[model samples]
Target: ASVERIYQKKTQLEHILLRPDTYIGSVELVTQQMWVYDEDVGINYREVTFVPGLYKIFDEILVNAADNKQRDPKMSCIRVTIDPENNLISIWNNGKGIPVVEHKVEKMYVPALIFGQLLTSSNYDDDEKKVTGGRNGYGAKLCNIFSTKFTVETASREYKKMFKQTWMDNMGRAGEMELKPFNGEDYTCITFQPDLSKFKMQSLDKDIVALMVRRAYDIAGSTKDVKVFLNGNKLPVKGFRSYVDMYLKDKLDETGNSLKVIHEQVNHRWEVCLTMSEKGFQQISFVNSIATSKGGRHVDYVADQIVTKLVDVVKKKNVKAHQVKNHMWIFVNALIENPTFDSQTKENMTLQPKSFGSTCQLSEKFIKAAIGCGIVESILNWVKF
Candidate 1:
């Protein structure tokens, strides 16, 4: 079959502008109830409003900043500032900043390569097997492309130099680059304002702001050794258990099952907690720093592993897998290598079970403790029901 030639190549910016949903998902408003922290007065508040797709652009830069912590042990602080009035978001991390030297082959400065260019990332090598949220090289650059105004400032203590650059109009143009001798520790900061007009959004409101704050809590919950802040107030979430405890203080489940923590482990690769008291089961899982809201292989794979072990210990009752009722709340944060997701937004992981580089174990301690906590008895009780 032969047809007339009408092939056209689109630049990265053009492509993103033409098909925004391919990279950024839907640009729509949704009514939602969310728990938001008021960093101004240090109080928790609940509100419902309309959220927009601009929120994901905000998360992209923050995730890039958070991934920097995985590279440097000295990384301690990550600060985020959200200004809905100005439609601006700024994120910073106290880690080793991008190198200021001009990339030998790429001709661009390392900071520009890292922040301004498409298909340029530190996590591009598959052989290295990184446990980072960014793998496709689109993390920060997608934000840059969606933004009307984007700025990058990086100070490298190793080079004793600072690098700065600005891009405008949805990466359609850029200003002069500034590199000067600096006397400071390593840090990287990115601030940008998404093109609200492009997304058809009026402005940032409480709904989108709450979603951003909730993402900040995800970073706080799964992270270690780093103090994350939103609007200058440090987040209180330490790990998965602390996150669950926060839920305990909040309202109970719809069925009136008070969330109670049964076991918790802040393991090397997995930060997990099991909670009881529920009408049924609920699972909260994250791969790397990204929440797998629709949880895929990792969720059930680990649950099957746990149930299989439990079935072996249940004696002559021959407790089949079907009889195992996991009514408990399972909270998980996993650091996975070469993780794949079902969508560009990554709300669910589609990576195979074998691809998970680290093993998810319930632990001998957890097994014994679960038995003592009447987890086995509860399973037996549900077996007959």
Candidate 2:
């Protein structure tokens, strides 16, 4: 027998069945505490604050769908079903399904390794040619480990086959896989119930999940053709203008003055949009569709460019544009083939040698152009009219 199989049978099952408490702790304790440090210096293996929680679990599923959509734009459909009654969420995507064979890296079934192993993913290359959300390879596996019950089913188009697996609890300690016939379209489906006992909260708010799904859909840049539904309600397409309008709908009139969207893709490396406001500012940025709430170099460049452009325009016109509050909302989707993030949660994008300068220049050019023609002229013209 393989060493993995031996370990699976002897080490895994013994611990789970003999001492269930040690294997899966009580409701209050989601993660077992561990110490890597002694006396003064130690590793504190406490709860990972950066872990996306139940809200972010939905994001991982949606992002996977988006990545699939990016690969096969022609046939990319994602359907999400929230079953509060059963405490389950099902994500279905029609795209290229996962490989059914054994994964070379993990030496296990491809689908099994995907959900069972940490830091194991096919999209680890730093190839700028393709843009995908999953780089760390932890999102899906984390979801699996944190779920009370997890199941993954994939129908491979090329192989003309199907594979399904189920994990009862805690990784694949107790799991089974089956090969089955599939006649329908190529697809992958993941159904999971977040282990509420393993989390800080008791239940996930469906409304918040819906909002985050909509936000993820917007960030994924999944076109109208790429359908995504949350609980039977289809998430509407949200572009730069439309999203900003939705955000500021009740506050301001639907006019050019309230918000101006700078939707421009400078190149394959950078896709950015700016919602400039006259007053207070709010910013949202992403690296590979994952939100970077904590700003990074790209965010810095965006703010600097907007401020500099406004200042330069004021100087050129010799008009008293005393102060332009940095009240600008920015949406930047950078395509870094091999993207680097500051943390596992992917909250910030690390500056890249090749793309940083290019992105800076692109933002500067776009901001200057918008200020010169779009923002200044339109707003001033509106005032006169």
Candidate 3:
């Protein structure tokens, strides 16, 4: 039992759960208050340098938007500027800034240190029960945990300000420490360089960024209007655009019947996207949740049923089997539960079967819908045949 407790301490990566109220002030600050001190601390005139190294980028960071509580719809946004030569990077966003006022601190132990509490807050939109980025009020803390310094600026109709915080390791009686700003602006900016000597894995890969971008599009609630820019460039949805090309290639001559789509609710949850391309039709499924990478049964069901249905569809409809690759591209994504794995460690998601489930359909009507709807032919032509 003692060893178990000790191990728990060692494996404890969550400091937010212990202090859920950390963001109470932050939420309140963003939605209800405004301050006067925000005008003095100008954007640090430091030349925010960045590099041309493997720069990974993403826009939409929200995870579950359709089912979680709603606070500020524009609660999050991030922009990155990089200067490779100097090994410097800067990220800024126009969202709820951090709390700078001296407020009471709540303490408790969740997984790790009893370090974090709500800075601000808002009631979940009663009319619309949305799946939000399980704030756990730890967004700022988590990011801060991974770096040496962080800063935030926020505003509301009442009190607005900026808060810059930082932490570091030294020979003193401290591993990390943060600073406070009595007041500032209504936007937040956090920049840091991973202490190579302390934490490994400084940068991210392109594929990781690409996948995250696609996930952002799916999870960012109904406010599909929000825009995301990466490294000063708008990241494109490779999957969505590829589908557009597959069906829109010379097929829509300002007149043909519009594209047809069949949405099936597999296992009552997983919604699989089946695309008809010139080369063949492909089936992709998305499990709505952030915990998806932590795979579950839904994934297996979706994969099995999609392949089975597509195979059966081509056979029954007499569409050349070759026209529909036996095993085509299958895209599976979902909004996972919060505390989404470990970002401090860049270990990618390896399929976990215990956490999956499909909420969509897998059948023949979907097949005909993919075909009779011209989705198949358009895709065929898009493939250049």
Candidate 4:
């Protein structure tokens, strides 16, 4: 009995459960200032206590729905609903719903197999240009495994079929997927209740729910053609410019000096905003519509490019990178292909500039605006504190 107990093997799901942090970052809750909102109260950025893992679980599913736009550019509407009282969240998109047919090898419906199994993905081609947030297949499945109850529903217009399925008990068991006739538009809706106890929380609080709503705006802001709604309330961030507006509300300096906001659209798929921030350097960025919460190499590249431009225009013999980057609040929402991240949570993108399907060029117009807006003057005279 001692020998058997000492040599026990764990399944994939068991391994994930044993080390949740490896897949979802920190499982412990931390108190930090994050966006908070309610239907009656509107929105505010304030201190709220919550776990980061909770937000990651929600985003993994949302990205899959948003990435469907790459498969169908005509995909029009995406809606998300968060029910904190019931500890439930639902996301729906009018894209061609996930394929509803049974897989020949897996012997399971593609939809079920995708969510219920590990090491399965649709993004394996090396040469394929990918504008998606999914890389490893562990994302949505991890959400499923961490949730108490996860459900998938999709209607395929071409086949005139609707598929519904449920996974429960940390995905230890999967209920049979039910198929039925349907006469409706093509769409996919996933609803799940993340088990609060797994994250050592009592319920979904204001902090966690607000973070989920913030993500809805992120997708809406990056993809101008796609519409996003949170709890029936439409997110008004239609493009990158409008998106930056959400971050600058009442964020003026102590002297009431407003940051110089630059809305530079590099192309149809890339937009940049480098404004003069009052505090230390801050960044709000996204790649392929997925928020780079912790940022990564993209931030480094943009900051370096700004310094180079500054040196050229200012004609200064010595202009440090920090001089330009210190007071700058950088925002980049670009469509990067085949991006990699530092962790399974994907908070930081690790791809180099050369790997992007295309790159965003910082037009001289941005430099001109920066000079006129006092950013250049400020950087020229910047001093370390």
Stretches of candidate 2 exceeding 4 Å from the true structure:
1-52, 104-106, 127-129, 219-225, 238-240, 253-257, 260-262, 265-271, 276-280, 315-325, 356-385
Question: Could you give candidate 4's per-residue lDDT for residues 1-385 as a string of tens digits?
Answer: 6988999899888889888887987789888877555445545667888887888898888888888888888798899988888989898999788778889998988889888899889998858888887889988898998899999998887777899999999988988879998877799999999988889998887678777777787788888589898878777776888777877766676667777787788887678888777767888888887889798777777767776776566664356666666778889887788899888888899999888778776888876776676567775555322
Q: How would you order the candidates by lDDT, starting with the best?
A: 4, 1, 2, 3
**Per-candidate TM vs. native?**
0.86, 0.72, 0.47, 0.93
| Regions more than 4 Å wrong, model 3 | 1-70, 74-77, 98-130, 135-142, 152-157, 170-185, 198-223, 236-272, 275-305, 311-326, 332-359, 362-366, 369-385
Clashes of 3: 83
By TM-score, who's the top model here?
Answer: 4
lDDT of each: 0.76, 0.61, 0.35, 0.81
**Tens-digit lDDT string for candidate 3 (300-354):** 5455554454456445542443444432334444432222233311112333434
Model 3 lDDT at residue 204? 34
The parts of candidate 4 lying over 4 Å away from their true place are: 1-8, 35-44, 312-319, 382-385
CA RMSD of all predictions: 3.7, 11.0, 13.2, 2.3
How do the residues 211-235 of candidate 2 rate in per-residue lDDT, one tens digit apiece? 4544544642424357667667665
Q: For model 3, where is the 10-residue window of minimal lDDT?
A: 27-36
lDDT of 1 at 102: 83
Q: Give the Å shift of residue 148 in candidate 4.
A: 1.0
For model 3, state the Cα shift of residue 68 in Å: 12
